[PDB]
Design a protein around this ligand. Sequence first.
Ligand SMILES: Cc1cc2nc3c(=O)[nH]c(=O)nc-3n(C[C@H](O)[C@H](O)[C@H](O)COP(=O)(O)OP(=O)(O)OC[C@H]3O[C@@H](n4cnc5c(N)ncnc54)[C@H](O)[C@@H]3O)c2cc1C
Ligand SMILES: Cc1cc2nc3c(=O)[nH]c(=O)nc-3n(C[C@H](O)[C@H](O)[C@H](O)COP(=O)(O)OP(=O)(O)OC[C@H]3O[C@@H](n4cnc5c(N)ncnc54)[C@H](O)[C@@H]3O)c2cc1C
Ligand SMILES: Nc1ncnc2c1ncn2[C@@H]1O[C@H](COP(=O)(O)OP(=O)(O)O)[C@@H](O)[C@H]1O
Ligand SMILES: Nc1ncnc2c1ncn2[C@@H]1O[C@H](COP(=O)(O)OP(=O)(O)O)[C@@H](O)[C@H]1O
Ligand SMILES: Nc1ncnc2c1ncn2[C@@H]1O[C@H](COP(=O)(O)OP(=O)(O)O)[C@@H](O)[C@H]1O
Lengths: 497, 497, 249
Amino acid sequence: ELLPEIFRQTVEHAPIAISITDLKANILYANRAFRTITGYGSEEVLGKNESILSNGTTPRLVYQALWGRLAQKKPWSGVLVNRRKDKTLYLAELTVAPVLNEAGETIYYLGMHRDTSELHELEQRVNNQRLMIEAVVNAAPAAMVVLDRQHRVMLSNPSFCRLARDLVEDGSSESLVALLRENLAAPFETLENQGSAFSGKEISFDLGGRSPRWLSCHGRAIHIENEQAHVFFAPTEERYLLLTINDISELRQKQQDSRLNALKALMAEEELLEGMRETFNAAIHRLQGPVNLISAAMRMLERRLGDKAGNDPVLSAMREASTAGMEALENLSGSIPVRMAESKMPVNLNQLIREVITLCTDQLLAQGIVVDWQPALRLPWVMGGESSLRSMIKHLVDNAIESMSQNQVSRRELFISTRVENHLVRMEITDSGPGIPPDLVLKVFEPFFSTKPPHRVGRGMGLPVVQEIVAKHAGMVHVDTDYREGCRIVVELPFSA
Amino acid sequence: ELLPEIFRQTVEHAPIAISITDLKANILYANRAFRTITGYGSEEVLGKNESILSNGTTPRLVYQALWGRLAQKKPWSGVLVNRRKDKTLYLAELTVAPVLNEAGETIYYLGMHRDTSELHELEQRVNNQRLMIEAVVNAAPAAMVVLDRQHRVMLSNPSFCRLARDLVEDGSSESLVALLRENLAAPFETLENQGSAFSGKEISFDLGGRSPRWLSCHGRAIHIENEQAHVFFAPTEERYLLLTINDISELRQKQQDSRLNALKALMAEEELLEGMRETFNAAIHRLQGPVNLISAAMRMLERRLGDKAGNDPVLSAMREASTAGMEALENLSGSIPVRMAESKMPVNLNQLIREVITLCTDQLLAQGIVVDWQPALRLPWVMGGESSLRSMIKHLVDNAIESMSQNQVSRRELFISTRVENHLVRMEITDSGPGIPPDLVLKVFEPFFSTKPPHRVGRGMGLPVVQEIVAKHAGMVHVDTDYREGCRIVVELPFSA
Amino acid sequence: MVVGHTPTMRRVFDQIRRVAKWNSTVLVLGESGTGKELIASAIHYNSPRAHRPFVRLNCAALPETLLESELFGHEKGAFTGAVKQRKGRFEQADGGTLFLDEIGEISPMFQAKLLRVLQEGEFERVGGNQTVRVNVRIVAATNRDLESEVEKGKFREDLYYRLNVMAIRIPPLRERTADIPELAEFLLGKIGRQQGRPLTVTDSAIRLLMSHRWPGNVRELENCLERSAIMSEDGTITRDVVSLTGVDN
Ligand SMILES: Cc1cc2nc3c(=O)[nH]c(=O)nc-3n(C[C@H](O)[C@H](O)[C@H](O)COP(=O)(O)OP(=O)(O)OC[C@H]3O[C@@H](n4cnc5c(N)ncnc54)[C@H](O)[C@@H]3O)c2cc1C
Ligand SMILES: Cc1cc2nc3c(=O)[nH]c(=O)nc-3n(C[C@H](O)[C@H](O)[C@H](O)COP(=O)(O)OP(=O)(O)OC[C@H]3O[C@@H](n4cnc5c(N)ncnc54)[C@H](O)[C@@H]3O)c2cc1C
Ligand SMILES: Nc1ncnc2c1ncn2[C@@H]1O[C@H](COP(=O)(O)OP(=O)(O)O)[C@@H](O)[C@H]1O
Ligand SMILES: Nc1ncnc2c1ncn2[C@@H]1O[C@H](COP(=O)(O)OP(=O)(O)O)[C@@H](O)[C@H]1O
Ligand SMILES: Nc1ncnc2c1ncn2[C@@H]1O[C@H](COP(=O)(O)OP(=O)(O)O)[C@@H](O)[C@H]1O
């Protein structure tokens, strides 16, 4: 109904490249924008084939589809890459439709296209940014995973899969995520609800038979804005959840070893210190007896004989024997070590017993001995030398263990308990052995007496030593005679209130 | 430029929604595409206002620019969220131009838009996937930096910035990369040139006076595809670098302490058993003297008494004194610790002298003692029990420290040296203590000898244990008579050729 | 708990925890106030028998008939006053430490009996004939000059030799005056802390301690410092305050 010139002006004033071509695609008309977008002048456009805009990158299937549907008198729609006069390349969404005369015959072709360079620049930037997550994920040695609001695994790395393969039977990242959620608990829920990044939460897994794996857990909220076209003026954000899981297993356990090793090291000197004191306590003792008997004898033979005593060769005989010993007793006594005041420091008795048991656990399991340790929940710390109180534990436990090898031990068990009785730290080490014969319960405490032969490590000194350590604390150590299914040694030592 | 009728068919077959409207924007004509794009039928469109396409989501401000720019006969270009007949919304890059009559007066208006929804859904997805990079990195503990082909910091987390503040003076991420780049070397070069993932590259940094900080470094390649519109059908990839660094410093520092501590127990346990064995000889030798002299008294006393020997109270007790002496001598001899078979193995004393000083460093520094250790460059292995040979050095050091502690020493120096002589491994420990008087050089080795004042911990047993264990190793130990500035003890032990 | 640093103390102190460990008899030679009971007590607390009964017996305070009865035990009606059968000290303290104060006042006839027990660890009741082997420990002690008694025949020589086997001669405080400052401080510090006020002794009294022959050793020392503190209103034990305790110069 409108004037034909209006349609002529409609194409002319468009800001997009519009061209009218012949059946050979030779451009017969072009608007202002076609000159502007394509860079061709008004006079330069007439007569040139549209094939010039092709750069060869477009698949030939696109052009044949373009031309093929034109032969069918049907429009064809698709996206091309056109080249401007300055040879710059832009994505041109070209659709070509036939011009039908009043008789329905195709007389001319119509070429329109719009710049869509931004479209590709952003999907590839999307594709690049999609590659960014995939690549960065692959790098983390810490098992890291990104979780959506439904906690679906969007991307995982080999390490997380390796952790899934190492922590989960199936080896799938998704299965590994499920287990981690239960253990994380509060940091995960806080991250999910408030998006608060959590870092450095340690959790523990005791899977049995293998050293528990201790993991450093970190996480943050990862935010995606809305993409849909209708939210261009007001994008809205969603939230994923990042979980970063780092291996710190050997780190925390190795703290235990050194203190465990300094534990056995520091104590290890005392049994020598008591041993050297104890071993030498035998020297004068065995000497002090026979020697003094002689020391009297000179005063004996002297008094009755009186004047003739000085001429008695017998009177000189014991004198020489007594003097030689008396020299030893003085020299032996005079060079005895005087213990230095070992720094009296706060000692956690439960801490040590849990620890000494760790050192001696291997030889307990070697005999099949079940170690049932029940540290007191509240045990006061004793102001004393940690090394010395530490040493006496090994002496008592070891000898009881050797009873665990005897066939009277129907069930091989080591029982260690600590309790405060009579205002003293009562240490009871009960065992399931044949025990000590009632008549020898103390003769074993005699230095150098060992019911098992001294031909093994049985110097008859372990029981004397524990007393000396106990005695140095003004304590008392006894074997519970009521228990007969083994030997129960009771040590009572003062503690700092 | 062409026949007017072509332009009318040009608009009708135009792929985009083209409508010709009056001055009020009421559509007077609609093309095929307007039907296809907006969903409005040919007849439903004629006479209807363009407001049917308006949804109200687009800000009204642009519409004044739309209508306003038409007044001055200028094109207006902008993007609107148009509404289709089905009420679906899409991004419409609308341009409105005036229709002029042959006299230059505006007679009609032109409505013309293109679909740009795909453009926005990706740029937001760009911003969305961009925010994935920004967030995920922050909470990760391992220090990571995203590096371009020129090693410029593309991304860094607070820890990396903290690490820069910790590893580099300026605290900048870029400068941290410079420090990190130098140390990585080959794994970084392999990753950069070939994109090969490297994991677990551990590097040690020694701060000086502090525990060296060990960093576990891991790195993977990041891939970016080309974004320009001209590679829509064939994107090209480039490579960036991610380094991921985890701190493993604390573990290694604690690792040395355990071995140092665990070995402290070994020596202390060993010297106890060895210390036992030598005290036996002193006790047996010490006992043998008086006991035998007691013994001789009986027979010589018996001969004079004759028949009166039977009823002599003097003889009976001294008779027992030897009997007790015989029992005392037997008790000492038969109770010697039968060492569990000590595997006589090749032992390198140079390894042990390094240990003891590290083991004994604590006490040496307390007294301001300077320790000069001169290990032999090539020390042949000493055949013998590693347990026995390990206790050797501490015994000699214990000799120096105790006398070293005596206040008669104004200058406190300790010198240790080792060398091979006469097919034997000869070791010497020299200190600046009171020393051994020349007449006491040899009888300090008779067991238990000690001239140290009782105030100190003088066992008199160090050298004797050395003498004891040296005898076990078929060697010889003596103190150098020539040295008078202190004590120089010489230990000779044969080595496995 | 026990202080001393002279060479004589090296024997006595080291002998304490030495014989503490073993089952051997102990003769504690020393005059009054030397510490014989506490030497045995320090011996016991340092003995493995620290957890077992520690028996102190004064052989001079009991009649000979009761002395023989007490150590080995007696049957009912063995002597006047034996209303009930009593277990012997050897057996009541079997596995314990027996402190026998003033061991040198025993009669010659019993001395033969004690000899056999100390040799074999075997003994007979007073009136019983069952030989019992016992892991009994003994701690004898005597201030008497047994040498005069054996010289005079009132003490059997065979046992006296067996009794002076473990002779730990506690030296008089006269020969260890260097230990007096260290001996006094432990008591003075303990009583000063115990009373809640500093119980300090003046220098004039200290000079007396250095020059004192010490017939009573530390017992006379202890009886004075504790009484002196009482009438020292501030605890500052002055020599006049020292004098009020009755210690002869
Ligand atoms: C109105 C109109 C506008 C066009 N606008 C563009 C544009 O903006 N950008 C662009 O790249 N291309 C455009 N073309 C297509 C252009 O004409 C070429 O087909 C294209 O550029 C490929 O040229 P070539 O030399 O690389 O390949 P060619 O092999 O020359 O052609 C590619 C395919 O098109 C067929 N074809 C080419 N010319 C004809 C013809 N005259 N008749 C029948 N089939 C034919 C060929 O048989 C072959 O299948 C337009 C075509 C028309 C009719
Ligand atoms: C050819 C053409 C095509 C258009 N296509 C669209 C489209 O696809 N989608 C869309 O949302 N809008 C389109 N508009 C704009 C439309 O006319 C309205 O401005 C818009 O829909 C907002 O309407 P409203 O009722 O919310 O605001 P209103 O207040 O009704 O109008 C918005 C502003 O435009 C001015 N204005 C409105 N009509 C006229 C007029 N006839 N002459 C002068 N000024 C006027 C008003 O003064 C006001 O400042 C088009 C306009 C023209 C001329
Ligand atoms: N818990 C125990 N169970 C059984 N026997 C024990 C126990 N503790 C000690 N003994 C006995 O005590 C004797 C002496 O031990 P001890 O004097 O401690 O040093 P050693 O065990 O080195 O000989 C041993 O022969 C042993 O039979
Ligand atoms: N390294 C040494 N430094 C100083 N004096 C020593 C050293 N070694 C030995 N002596 C002297 O020799 C004596 C005997 O030493 P030894 O038999 O090793 O045991 P102890 O050193 O414990 O007495 C000591 O009394 C000491 O005076
Ligand atoms: N070596 C010592 N160190 C500290 N105090 C001592 C020492 N010897 C004795 N005493 C003190 O002497 C007091 C009495 O000792 P006691 O046992 O009566 O000696 P004795 O048996 O000679 O009478 C005790 O209270 C004790 O504290």
